[model samples]
Target: SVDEMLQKVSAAIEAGQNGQAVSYFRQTIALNIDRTEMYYWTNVDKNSEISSKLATELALAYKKNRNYDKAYLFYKELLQKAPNNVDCLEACAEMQVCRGQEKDALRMYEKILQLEADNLAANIFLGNYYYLTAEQEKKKLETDYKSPTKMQYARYRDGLSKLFTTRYEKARNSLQKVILRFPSTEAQKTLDKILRIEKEVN
Candidate 1:
């Protein structure tokens, strides 16, 4: 019935109802799994044309529909099945970041950087993540201490700022590449903010 499902999936795609297309694509995947290795004919065939291509299509449909939570899982699956793929890694990292699992996304982005050092978007996102995480930790320290002395406040803010200097610098370095390679205002604006915040406690 994969042929039937395939027809229906392409139909859904043509209709711009990719949510339905994703549904059918997953159905086709599941069916293929159940039938695989059950017989000679049941064996997955490269010649038959499925699996990775279907999964690639399915994941893209999930993403185009903004189903990021779902998109993350499928993208993660794709990432696991093969050698590291840059586009798949990028998509998975983006979905993970969208779903509040940004630290996980951070690792994925770092992997992306290793695979392609000059990657502009990955650099932008890594810079963004590093700075955001520092800010988040800064807030926790500011709030959790709860009404300390002026000196404690100074120590907390200034000392913690030093603690996160590495992160700010990493943010700076990563975004610096974006400016160097591409000349992006987006990178410059974030760079300015990171610099201001780095000096905030002093």
Candidate 2:
């Protein structure tokens, strides 16, 4: 019965019929898992992978079906057990961004980095964040500061110059680590763009 239900869930996911997948997974997991009281689900047998995999696929299905809250709950459930689950960390962090929760997304990426220092996706994300933030900061100085204070004056003077010198330099280094070990057009282009901007700023 569980295998048959899982069969349908897998088929729905494969079809990108996320709507169908959402319902199937909800029914499948609900049937397989049981609770002793109103508090804890103490009856599910963890003899194989389907129990957990079902939840994850269900989360993605919920995500694609626009049920953000349910999706987060499922992802958080998985993370509770496997905190170092890089895929779920990345996926949950991405959904956090989709919900415009950038601060939380940053924390997830930082957690990912702690576990996987050379994580390509996290490195790329941080590289873009640093570069874009510096770009915006430099622009504001040009319009916002009339004759900045001494500390602001130094930052203003070096803002664009140091913008790349320090800010995108961080971007440059992060991306470089990714490109050296793996082939990536995105990293290559970002690196090239940073170099171009660095020259223009100076």
Candidate 3:
């Protein structure tokens, strides 16, 4: 019953047809009234992708409409549904950074890096995070270890820039391997960016 609309909704969502998708999903719920609870209240939801995508769209819509708070809330909801979701993570991380939550976001990125040593997005965020964090720390440090700090910062900064600047196809292959095999680590946003860049670069 709902399967047909589910498939259509998934396709519509993937194709960026959110208006049609929401309508179909509503119809799906109407058709399968008995299964509404099951479909809508599962572990992270049955269609996590759709929910996350809708969250992103809502975020974007609010941003376009100049409702920053609503956009931020949408991004926050996106984070709740998919803590390991790349887009959600990036959006939340960025918003936090903008709102002066750099340390918090950096901590999150560090946790991600601890879990996945090669997460490029986390690395990029960490690089920016470190650059800003370092400036604050630089003012506090009285020790003569500025040289060591600079060395560490250089490594993170250069490495992160290199990670993003790598050949797109190669980057996609590497990121895809992580996405396909290491679901727990989470690197899909990096993979998606690589795919986008591959098309643009070609």
Candidate 4:
């Protein structure tokens, strides 16, 4: 028993016709129709159907328009429906990053790792994160260029000698997996570049 106003409004919103959408939303709200979707989700399947779709689209639009606060609220509402979804988690994590809430993003990554150990994206990101931390430590060392060079040589030689000691030898190890697992893709370009660089110098 969809009303004509509600039908036109829903169709307008679905067709990317936001002007009609806003007008119809206001009209429906005025009628106390509760037929128009909003920032929140409804428990009933019929009501929630329009609500979730509109909310998700509006959330993305808000995010794209740099209205992060509104975007955050909508994404939070979306999460209520699909808590364990990686897309929602990553979207939230990225928005948190944009807001300079990196620790929160890291926590999201950690939570994802807990839910899915050996997740390729998680493992690869962790590998690069630790490698970057190591590079930062190397930058802080007061040693001369020669000393760092010597240390680098020693570490590599030892690593090569004990190559079988760990599951992964270095950050670049994950690149190989990325290439092999995601073959014929852009990663091979990155892998080719890394392979061209010898370990000790950089």
Name the best candidate (by TM-score): 2
What lDDT would each prediction earn against the true structure?
0.71, 0.71, 0.56, 0.57
> Against the correct fold, how does model 3 do in TM-score?
0.42
Q: Distance (Å) between predicted and true CA of 86, model 2?
A: 1.9
What are the per-residue Cα lDDT tens digits for candidate 4 across 1-202?
A: 3356666765776787767765665565446433433323442233445566656665676677776766777787777788887667666766776777778777876676677754566555655654455445444442423334776767655543343223224555654555545564544664454444335333
Model 2: number of backbone collisions? 0
lDDT of 1 by residue, 1-202 (tens): 7667767766766676767766776677567633321221333332423445555655666677777876776677667775477887888888987788868888888998899887887988888878888878878887866745787877777757675667777888888888874787778888778767766665
Q: Give the C-alpha lDDT of model 2.
A: 0.71
- Give per-residue CA lDDT, model 2, range 66-175, as digits (tens): 76666787787778767898887987887787777889998998899889888888888888888788778877878765634788766667767756677878778778
Name the regions of candidate 3 deviating beyond 4 angstroms.
Answer: 1-19, 22-50, 63-68, 135-202
User: How well does candidate 1 score on lDDT at residue 159?
Assistant: 56
Clashing pairs in 3: none
lDDT of 3 by residue, 1-202 (tens): 6766667766776787878977776665447633532443442243545676444554665566555555667687767766876656666666666666657776665666656776766765554333344334433442333345777766555544444354333434445535554563335655554456345423
Error of 2 at 6 (Å): 9.5
Compute each candidate's TM-score over C-alphas.
0.65, 0.68, 0.42, 0.54
